PDB file of C-alpha atoms and ligand atoms in Angstrom:
ATOM      1  CA  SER A 125      51.507 -35.903 -43.164  1.00  0.00           C
ATOM      2  CA  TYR A 126      51.130 -33.392 -45.987  1.00  0.00           C
ATOM      3  CA  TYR A 127      52.872 -30.140 -46.899  1.00  0.00           C
ATOM      4  CA  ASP A 128      51.228 -27.090 -45.354  1.00  0.00           C
ATOM      5  CA  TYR A 129      52.481 -24.894 -48.180  1.00  0.00           C
ATOM      6  CA  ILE A 130      53.306 -25.317 -51.791  1.00  0.00           C
ATOM      7  CA  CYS A 131      55.709 -22.688 -52.963  1.00  0.00           C
ATOM      8  CA  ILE A 132      55.300 -22.126 -56.734  1.00  0.00           C
ATOM      9  CA  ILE A 133      58.196 -20.581 -58.622  1.00  0.00           C
ATOM     10  CA  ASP A 134      58.189 -19.861 -62.339  1.00  0.00           C
ATOM     11  CA  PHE A 135      61.046 -17.753 -63.791  1.00  0.00           C
ATOM     12  CA  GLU A 136      61.343 -15.581 -66.837  1.00  0.00           C
ATOM     13  CA  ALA A 137      64.724 -15.413 -68.515  1.00  0.00           C
ATOM     14  CA  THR A 138      66.641 -13.650 -71.249  1.00  0.00           C
ATOM     15  CA  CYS A 139      66.202 -15.329 -74.656  1.00  0.00           C
ATOM     16  CA  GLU A 140      66.715 -14.929 -78.406  1.00  0.00           C
ATOM     17  CA  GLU A 141      64.369 -15.694 -81.244  1.00  0.00           C
ATOM     18  CA  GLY A 142      64.703 -19.153 -82.758  1.00  0.00           C
ATOM     19  CA  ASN A 143      65.861 -20.302 -79.329  1.00  0.00           C
ATOM     20  CA  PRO A 144      69.607 -20.576 -80.256  1.00  0.00           C
ATOM     21  CA  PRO A 145      71.130 -23.649 -78.591  1.00  0.00           C
ATOM     22  CA  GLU A 146      74.209 -21.980 -77.057  1.00  0.00           C
ATOM     23  CA  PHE A 147      72.665 -18.784 -75.676  1.00  0.00           C
ATOM     24  CA  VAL A 148      73.298 -18.144 -71.972  1.00  0.00           C
ATOM     25  CA  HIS A 149      69.991 -17.551 -70.135  1.00  0.00           C
ATOM     26  CA  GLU A 150      69.756 -15.295 -67.134  1.00  0.00           C
ATOM     27  CA  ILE A 151      66.802 -14.997 -64.799  1.00  0.00           C
ATOM     28  CA  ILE A 152      64.976 -11.689 -65.312  1.00  0.00           C
ATOM     29  CA  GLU A 153      61.898 -12.364 -63.138  1.00  0.00           C
ATOM     30  CA  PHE A 154      61.675 -14.279 -59.844  1.00  0.00           C
ATOM     31  CA  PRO A 155      58.090 -14.617 -58.624  1.00  0.00           C
ATOM     32  CA  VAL A 156      56.874 -16.548 -55.596  1.00  0.00           C
ATOM     33  CA  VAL A 157      53.324 -17.748 -55.059  1.00  0.00           C
ATOM     34  CA  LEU A 158      52.480 -19.337 -51.705  1.00  0.00           C
ATOM     35  CA  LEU A 159      49.649 -21.834 -51.748  1.00  0.00           C
ATOM     36  CA  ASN A 160      48.212 -22.983 -48.435  1.00  0.00           C
ATOM     37  CA  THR A 161      47.334 -26.647 -48.907  1.00  0.00           C
ATOM     38  CA  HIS A 162      44.681 -26.588 -46.141  1.00  0.00           C
ATOM     39  CA  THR A 163      42.595 -23.568 -47.088  1.00  0.00           C
ATOM     40  CA  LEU A 164      43.468 -24.194 -50.771  1.00  0.00           C
ATOM     41  CA  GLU A 165      43.999 -20.429 -51.121  1.00  0.00           C
ATOM     42  CA  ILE A 166      46.841 -18.442 -52.661  1.00  0.00           C
ATOM     43  CA  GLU A 167      48.052 -16.668 -49.546  1.00  0.00           C
ATOM     44  CA  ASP A 168      51.083 -14.670 -50.654  1.00  0.00           C
ATOM     45  CA  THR A 169      52.491 -13.437 -53.918  1.00  0.00           C
ATOM     46  CA  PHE A 170      55.812 -11.663 -54.397  1.00  0.00           C
ATOM     47  CA  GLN A 171      57.283 -10.394 -57.636  1.00  0.00           C
ATOM     48  CA  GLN A 172      60.817  -9.200 -58.313  1.00  0.00           C
ATOM     49  CA  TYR A 173      62.717  -8.438 -61.453  1.00  0.00           C
ATOM     50  CA  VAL A 174      66.385  -9.329 -61.806  1.00  0.00           C
ATOM     51  CA  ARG A 175      69.147  -7.392 -63.564  1.00  0.00           C
ATOM     52  CA  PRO A 176      71.175  -9.577 -65.935  1.00  0.00           C
ATOM     53  CA  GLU A 177      74.951  -9.060 -65.911  1.00  0.00           C
ATOM     54  CA  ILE A 178      76.223 -11.083 -68.866  1.00  0.00           C
ATOM     55  CA  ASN A 179      73.782 -10.340 -71.737  1.00  0.00           C
ATOM     56  CA  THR A 180      72.465  -7.159 -70.147  1.00  0.00           C
ATOM     57  CA  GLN A 181      70.472  -5.769 -73.077  1.00  0.00           C
ATOM     58  CA  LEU A 182      67.189  -7.699 -73.434  1.00  0.00           C
ATOM     59  CA  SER A 183      66.413  -8.682 -77.011  1.00  0.00           C
ATOM     60  CA  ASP A 184      63.313  -7.419 -78.819  1.00  0.00           C
ATOM     61  CA  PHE A 185      62.066 -10.983 -78.980  1.00  0.00           C
ATOM     62  CA  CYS A 186      62.453 -11.195 -75.189  1.00  0.00           C
ATOM     63  CA  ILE A 187      60.875  -7.798 -74.443  1.00  0.00           C
ATOM     64  CA  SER A 188      57.877  -8.801 -76.480  1.00  0.00           C
ATOM     65  CA  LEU A 189      57.500 -12.396 -75.378  1.00  0.00           C
ATOM     66  CA  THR A 190      57.688 -11.643 -71.649  1.00  0.00           C
ATOM     67  CA  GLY A 191      56.470  -8.052 -71.623  1.00  0.00           C
ATOM     68  CA  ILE A 192      59.435  -7.072 -69.395  1.00  0.00           C
ATOM     69  CA  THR A 193      61.137  -3.826 -70.505  1.00  0.00           C
ATOM     70  CA  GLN A 194      64.780  -2.800 -70.412  1.00  0.00           C
ATOM     71  CA  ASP A 195      63.975  -0.004 -67.981  1.00  0.00           C
ATOM     72  CA  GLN A 196      62.581  -2.636 -65.635  1.00  0.00           C
ATOM     73  CA  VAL A 197      65.650  -4.874 -65.574  1.00  0.00           C
ATOM     74  CA  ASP A 198      67.948  -1.826 -65.486  1.00  0.00           C
ATOM     75  CA  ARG A 199      66.335  -0.624 -62.287  1.00  0.00           C
ATOM     76  CA  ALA A 200      66.278  -4.107 -60.705  1.00  0.00           C
ATOM     77  CA  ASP A 201      68.595  -5.819 -58.194  1.00  0.00           C
ATOM     78  CA  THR A 202      71.112  -8.483 -59.279  1.00  0.00           C
ATOM     79  CA  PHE A 203      70.251 -12.130 -58.793  1.00  0.00           C
ATOM     80  CA  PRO A 204      72.080 -12.734 -55.499  1.00  0.00           C
ATOM     81  CA  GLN A 205      70.294  -9.709 -53.988  1.00  0.00           C
ATOM     82  CA  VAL A 206      66.926 -10.955 -55.244  1.00  0.00           C
ATOM     83  CA  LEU A 207      67.629 -14.436 -53.905  1.00  0.00           C
ATOM     84  CA  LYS A 208      68.459 -12.978 -50.436  1.00  0.00           C
ATOM     85  CA  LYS A 209      65.025 -11.329 -50.510  1.00  0.00           C
ATOM     86  CA  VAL A 210      63.126 -14.394 -51.655  1.00  0.00           C
ATOM     87  CA  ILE A 211      64.841 -16.299 -48.848  1.00  0.00           C
ATOM     88  CA  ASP A 212      63.899 -13.533 -46.397  1.00  0.00           C
ATOM     89  CA  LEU A 213      60.255 -13.769 -47.532  1.00  0.00           C
ATOM     90  CA  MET A 214      60.265 -17.542 -47.106  1.00  0.00           C
ATOM     91  CA  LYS A 215      61.864 -17.109 -43.683  1.00  0.00           C
ATOM     92  CA  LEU A 216      59.094 -14.586 -42.815  1.00  0.00           C
ATOM     93  CA  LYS A 217      56.311 -17.002 -43.742  1.00  0.00           C
ATOM     94  CA  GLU A 218      58.256 -19.487 -41.612  1.00  0.00           C
ATOM     95  CA  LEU A 219      58.653 -22.232 -44.239  1.00  0.00           C
ATOM     96  CA  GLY A 220      60.715 -25.212 -43.167  1.00  0.00           C
ATOM     97  CA  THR A 221      60.602 -24.236 -39.492  1.00  0.00           C
ATOM     98  CA  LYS A 222      56.973 -23.737 -38.426  1.00  0.00           C
ATOM     99  CA  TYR A 223      55.406 -25.049 -41.679  1.00  0.00           C
ATOM    100  CA  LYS A 224      56.146 -28.085 -43.823  1.00  0.00           C
ATOM    101  CA  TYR A 225      56.542 -26.982 -47.448  1.00  0.00           C
ATOM    102  CA  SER A 226      57.677 -27.895 -50.944  1.00  0.00           C
ATOM    103  CA  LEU A 227      58.630 -26.202 -54.227  1.00  0.00           C
ATOM    104  CA  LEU A 228      56.507 -26.586 -57.319  1.00  0.00           C
ATOM    105  CA  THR A 229      57.356 -25.570 -60.884  1.00  0.00           C
ATOM    106  CA  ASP A 230      55.706 -25.982 -64.262  1.00  0.00           C
ATOM    107  CA  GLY A 231      58.081 -28.381 -65.982  1.00  0.00           C
ATOM    108  CA  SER A 232      61.725 -29.028 -65.071  1.00  0.00           C
ATOM    109  CA  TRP A 233      63.519 -26.061 -66.625  1.00  0.00           C
ATOM    110  CA  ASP A 234      63.089 -23.534 -63.797  1.00  0.00           C
ATOM    111  CA  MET A 235      65.278 -25.496 -61.416  1.00  0.00           C
ATOM    112  CA  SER A 236      67.477 -27.698 -63.568  1.00  0.00           C
ATOM    113  CA  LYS A 237      68.212 -25.118 -66.257  1.00  0.00           C
ATOM    114  CA  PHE A 238      67.472 -21.489 -65.253  1.00  0.00           C
ATOM    115  CA  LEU A 239      68.300 -21.576 -61.547  1.00  0.00           C
ATOM    116  CA  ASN A 240      71.108 -24.013 -62.289  1.00  0.00           C
ATOM    117  CA  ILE A 241      72.768 -21.756 -64.883  1.00  0.00           C
ATOM    118  CA  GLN A 242      72.084 -18.560 -62.941  1.00  0.00           C
ATOM    119  CA  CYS A 243      73.880 -19.758 -59.807  1.00  0.00           C
ATOM    120  CA  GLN A 244      76.943 -20.617 -61.855  1.00  0.00           C
ATOM    121  CA  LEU A 245      76.834 -17.177 -63.445  1.00  0.00           C
ATOM    122  CA  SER A 246      76.388 -15.494 -60.070  1.00  0.00           C
ATOM    123  CA  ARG A 247      79.112 -17.652 -58.504  1.00  0.00           C
ATOM    124  CA  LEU A 248      76.684 -19.088 -55.912  1.00  0.00           C
ATOM    125  CA  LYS A 249      76.445 -22.577 -54.477  1.00  0.00           C
ATOM    126  CA  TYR A 250      73.147 -24.043 -55.667  1.00  0.00           C
ATOM    127  CA  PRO A 251      70.767 -23.563 -52.712  1.00  0.00           C
ATOM    128  CA  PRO A 252      69.960 -26.897 -51.004  1.00  0.00           C
ATOM    129  CA  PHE A 253      66.274 -25.979 -50.509  1.00  0.00           C
ATOM    130  CA  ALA A 254      65.868 -25.971 -54.280  1.00  0.00           C
ATOM    131  CA  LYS A 255      67.441 -29.351 -55.016  1.00  0.00           C
ATOM    132  CA  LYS A 256      64.060 -31.161 -54.990  1.00  0.00           C
ATOM    133  CA  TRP A 257      60.722 -30.083 -56.432  1.00  0.00           C
ATOM    134  CA  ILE A 258      57.286 -31.011 -57.739  1.00  0.00           C
ATOM    135  CA  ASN A 259      57.150 -30.796 -61.497  1.00  0.00           C
ATOM    136  CA  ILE A 260      53.426 -30.405 -61.977  1.00  0.00           C
ATOM    137  CA  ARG A 261      53.580 -31.357 -65.673  1.00  0.00           C
ATOM    138  CA  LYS A 262      54.915 -34.704 -64.503  1.00  0.00           C
ATOM    139  CA  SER A 263      52.324 -34.919 -61.694  1.00  0.00           C
ATOM    140  CA  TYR A 264      49.555 -34.108 -64.189  1.00  0.00           C
ATOM    141  CA  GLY A 265      50.817 -36.637 -66.778  1.00  0.00           C
ATOM    142  CA  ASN A 266      50.835 -39.420 -64.201  1.00  0.00           C
ATOM    143  CA  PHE A 267      47.617 -38.493 -62.435  1.00  0.00           C
ATOM    144  CA  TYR A 268      45.381 -38.082 -65.526  1.00  0.00           C
ATOM    145  CA  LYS A 269      47.436 -40.634 -67.489  1.00  0.00           C
ATOM    146  CA  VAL A 270      48.338 -38.691 -70.620  1.00  0.00           C
ATOM    147  CA  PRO A 271      51.474 -38.420 -72.748  1.00  0.00           C
ATOM    148  CA  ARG A 272      53.994 -35.738 -71.911  1.00  0.00           C
ATOM    149  CA  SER A 273      53.046 -33.482 -74.858  1.00  0.00           C
ATOM    150  CA  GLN A 274      49.569 -33.084 -73.355  1.00  0.00           C
ATOM    151  CA  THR A 275      50.881 -31.425 -70.198  1.00  0.00           C
ATOM    152  CA  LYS A 276      51.737 -28.075 -71.804  1.00  0.00           C
ATOM    153  CA  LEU A 277      50.215 -25.330 -69.663  1.00  0.00           C
ATOM    154  CA  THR A 278      47.740 -24.481 -72.426  1.00  0.00           C
ATOM    155  CA  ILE A 279      46.378 -28.015 -72.630  1.00  0.00           C
ATOM    156  CA  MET A 280      46.289 -28.556 -68.878  1.00  0.00           C
ATOM    157  CA  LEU A 281      44.098 -25.476 -68.459  1.00  0.00           C
ATOM    158  CA  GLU A 282      41.897 -26.399 -71.368  1.00  0.00           C
ATOM    159  CA  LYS A 283      41.338 -30.020 -70.297  1.00  0.00           C
ATOM    160  CA  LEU A 284      40.490 -28.968 -66.771  1.00  0.00           C
ATOM    161  CA  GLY A 285      37.975 -26.463 -68.176  1.00  0.00           C
ATOM    162  CA  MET A 286      39.792 -23.358 -67.007  1.00  0.00           C
ATOM    163  CA  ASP A 287      41.222 -20.194 -68.528  1.00  0.00           C
ATOM    164  CA  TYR A 288      44.593 -18.565 -68.561  1.00  0.00           C
ATOM    165  CA  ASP A 289      44.250 -15.474 -66.320  1.00  0.00           C
ATOM    166  CA  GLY A 290      46.528 -12.484 -67.021  1.00  0.00           C
ATOM    167  CA  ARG A 291      49.512 -12.134 -69.324  1.00  0.00           C
ATOM    168  CA  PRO A 292      51.294 -15.075 -70.900  1.00  0.00           C
ATOM    169  CA  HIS A 293      55.053 -15.331 -70.118  1.00  0.00           C
ATOM    170  CA  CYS A 294      54.645 -13.024 -67.175  1.00  0.00           C
ATOM    171  CA  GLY A 295      56.115 -15.155 -64.375  1.00  0.00           C
ATOM    172  CA  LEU A 296      53.777 -14.025 -61.607  1.00  0.00           C
ATOM    173  CA  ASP A 297      50.603 -14.630 -63.666  1.00  0.00           C
ATOM    174  CA  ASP A 298      52.063 -17.878 -64.882  1.00  0.00           C
ATOM    175  CA  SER A 299      52.771 -19.002 -61.310  1.00  0.00           C
ATOM    176  CA  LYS A 300      49.218 -18.108 -60.293  1.00  0.00           C
ATOM    177  CA  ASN A 301      47.671 -20.190 -63.086  1.00  0.00           C
ATOM    178  CA  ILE A 302      49.983 -23.041 -62.058  1.00  0.00           C
ATOM    179  CA  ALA A 303      48.763 -22.704 -58.470  1.00  0.00           C
ATOM    180  CA  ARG A 304      45.165 -22.775 -59.743  1.00  0.00           C
ATOM    181  CA  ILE A 305      45.887 -26.132 -61.395  1.00  0.00           C
ATOM    182  CA  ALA A 306      47.562 -27.388 -58.224  1.00  0.00           C
ATOM    183  CA  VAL A 307      44.430 -26.556 -56.294  1.00  0.00           C
ATOM    184  CA  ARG A 308      42.248 -28.278 -58.793  1.00  0.00           C
ATOM    185  CA  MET A 309      44.452 -31.407 -58.779  1.00  0.00           C
ATOM    186  CA  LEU A 310      44.461 -31.516 -54.980  1.00  0.00           C
ATOM    187  CA  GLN A 311      40.655 -31.315 -55.179  1.00  0.00           C
ATOM    188  CA  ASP A 312      40.545 -34.151 -57.761  1.00  0.00           C
ATOM    189  CA  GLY A 313      42.280 -36.109 -54.989  1.00  0.00           C
ATOM    190  CA  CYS A 314      45.818 -36.149 -56.367  1.00  0.00           C
ATOM    191  CA  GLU A 315      48.520 -35.962 -53.679  1.00  0.00           C
ATOM    192  CA  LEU A 316      51.088 -33.574 -55.237  1.00  0.00           C
ATOM    193  CA  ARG A 317      54.555 -34.586 -54.082  1.00  0.00           C
ATOM    194  CA  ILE A 318      58.244 -34.157 -54.896  1.00  0.00           C
ATOM    195  CA  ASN A 319      59.009 -36.042 -58.111  1.00  0.00           C
ATOM    196  CA  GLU A 320      62.215 -34.498 -59.497  1.00  0.00           C
ATOM    197  CA  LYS A 321      65.665 -33.474 -58.247  1.00  0.00           C
ATOM    198  CA  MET A 322      69.205 -32.365 -59.008  1.00  0.00           C
ATOM    199  CA  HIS A 323      71.980 -34.895 -58.665  1.00  0.00           C
ATOM    200  CA  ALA A 324      75.548 -34.258 -59.835  1.00  0.00           C
ATOM    201  CA  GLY A 325      74.053 -31.230 -61.665  1.00  0.00           C
ATOM    202  CA  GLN A 326      71.702 -33.476 -63.655  1.00  0.00           C
ATOM    203  CA  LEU A 327      67.958 -33.835 -63.747  1.00  0.00           C
ATOM    204  CA  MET A 328      66.762 -37.009 -62.077  1.00  0.00           C
ATOM    205  CA  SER A 329      63.393 -38.425 -60.997  1.00  0.00           C
ATOM    206  CA  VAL A 330      62.359 -39.130 -57.410  1.00  0.00           C
ATOM    207  CA  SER A 331      60.300 -42.176 -56.369  1.00  0.00           C
ATOM    208  CA  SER A 332      56.642 -41.281 -56.019  1.00  0.00           C
ATOM    209  CA  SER A 333      56.101 -44.125 -53.584  1.00  0.00           C
ATOM    210  CA  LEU A 334      58.193 -42.628 -50.773  1.00  0.00           C
ATOM    211  CA  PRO A 335      56.903 -40.757 -47.707  1.00  0.00           C
ATOM    212  CA  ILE A 336      56.137 -37.025 -47.749  1.00  0.00           C
ATOM    213  CA  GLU A 337      59.231 -35.126 -46.675  1.00  0.00           C
ATOM    214  CA  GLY A 338      59.423 -31.360 -46.189  1.00  0.00           C
ATOM    215  CA  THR A 339      61.965 -29.141 -47.888  1.00  0.00           C
ATOM    216  CA  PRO A 340      64.513 -27.813 -45.367  1.00  0.00           C
ATOM    217  CA  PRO A 341      64.211 -24.194 -44.227  1.00  0.00           C
ATOM    218  CA  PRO A 342      65.989 -22.080 -46.849  1.00  0.00           C
ATOM    219  CA  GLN A 343      69.378 -20.507 -46.188  1.00  0.00           C
ATOM    220  CA  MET A 344      71.274 -17.967 -48.277  1.00  0.00           C
ATOM    221  CA  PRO A 345      74.014 -19.823 -50.137  1.00  0.00           C
ATOM    222  CA  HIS A 346      77.553 -18.491 -50.036  1.00  0.00           C
ATOM    223  CA  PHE A 347      79.629 -17.434 -52.950  1.00  0.00           C
ATOM    224  CA  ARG A 348      81.485 -20.356 -54.524  1.00  0.00           C
ATOM    225  CA  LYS A 349      85.088 -19.787 -53.529  1.00  0.00           C
TER     226      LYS A 349
HETATM  227  N1  AMP B 401      58.865 -19.393 -77.581  1.00  0.00           N
HETATM  228  C1  AMP B 401      59.993 -19.219 -76.858  1.00  0.00           C
HETATM  229  N2  AMP B 401      61.188 -18.978 -77.455  1.00  0.00           N
HETATM  230  C2  AMP B 401      62.329 -18.801 -76.736  1.00  0.00           C
HETATM  231  N3  AMP B 401      62.375 -18.848 -75.384  1.00  0.00           N
HETATM  232  C3  AMP B 401      61.237 -19.092 -74.669  1.00  0.00           C
HETATM  233  C4  AMP B 401      59.955 -19.296 -75.377  1.00  0.00           C
HETATM  234  N4  AMP B 401      59.009 -19.510 -74.441  1.00  0.00           N
HETATM  235  C5  AMP B 401      59.626 -19.445 -73.235  1.00  0.00           C
HETATM  236  N5  AMP B 401      60.953 -19.208 -73.369  1.00  0.00           N
HETATM  237  C6  AMP B 401      61.949 -19.043 -72.282  1.00  0.00           C
HETATM  238  O1  AMP B 401      61.501 -19.626 -71.056  1.00  0.00           O
HETATM  239  C7  AMP B 401      61.284 -18.613 -70.068  1.00  0.00           C
HETATM  240  C8  AMP B 401      60.118 -18.959 -69.148  1.00  0.00           C
HETATM  241  O2  AMP B 401      59.114 -19.655 -69.887  1.00  0.00           O
HETATM  242  P1  AMP B 401      57.525 -19.397 -69.673  1.00  0.00           P
HETATM  243  O3  AMP B 401      57.235 -20.072 -68.342  1.00  0.00           O
HETATM  244  O4  AMP B 401      56.908 -20.085 -70.874  1.00  0.00           O
HETATM  245  O5  AMP B 401      57.331 -17.890 -69.686  1.00  0.00           O
HETATM  246  C9  AMP B 401      61.090 -17.332 -70.863  1.00  0.00           C
HETATM  247  O6  AMP B 401      61.462 -16.185 -70.108  1.00  0.00           O
HETATM  248  C10 AMP B 401      62.005 -17.547 -72.047  1.00  0.00           C
HETATM  249  O7  AMP B 401      63.347 -17.187 -71.740  1.00  0.00           O
HETATM  250 MG1   MG B 402      58.537 -21.359 -66.798  1.00  0.00          MG
HETATM  251 MG1   MG B 403      56.689 -18.224 -67.075  1.00  0.00          MG
END
């Protein structure tokens, strides 16, 4: 039987203009949006900013694209501290123990790039609970049967006859819009399910024809020795 909760995560990260290929991203915003699959309502939202430690000064391009200011990241906890809190929130809403749940992200960068890089930077083991997720862009592409380029957030909203609510590149607002699409897709009868994973630190697909399996209750990973 189906997930009780979909847990939507969409990060914001440091960046440069022109998107330089060798620039080391760090997570600067870690939102969580909890969607109850039964009531189809967004039940919980939590926002937290993260303080980068490598490239600590946000670029102008970044401050403007995301809206996040230096004073915000400066006053924020470091990633491991923020992760402990996200895990504590998840533990509070009893995910993995009382309720069957799954992660959902918009694309495959949040887990396989941003969280992946960040854990290396923070010297953390990659948290098991985040090794499998629902990439909604993929879900959408397969459900409505459109090429990959048509699954950009902008187009998904447009084609479903919806609007972008709130600020672009603000992770919380982004996550909420994502959840709003999830709802709509569930309503259109699409069974959202895990379709992507990490394996040997590489992005890999996951068979869509296999039974619904909950994500394990989250734990706080240790520091890599
Ligand atoms: N146009 C862009 N140029 C460079 N980096 C970007 C751009 N759009 C998004 N990103 C990176 O991806 C992160 C999250 O993407 P988004 O979900 O589009 O806000 C941002 O915090 C940026 O670090
Ligand atoms: Mg994103
Ligand atoms: Mg975003």
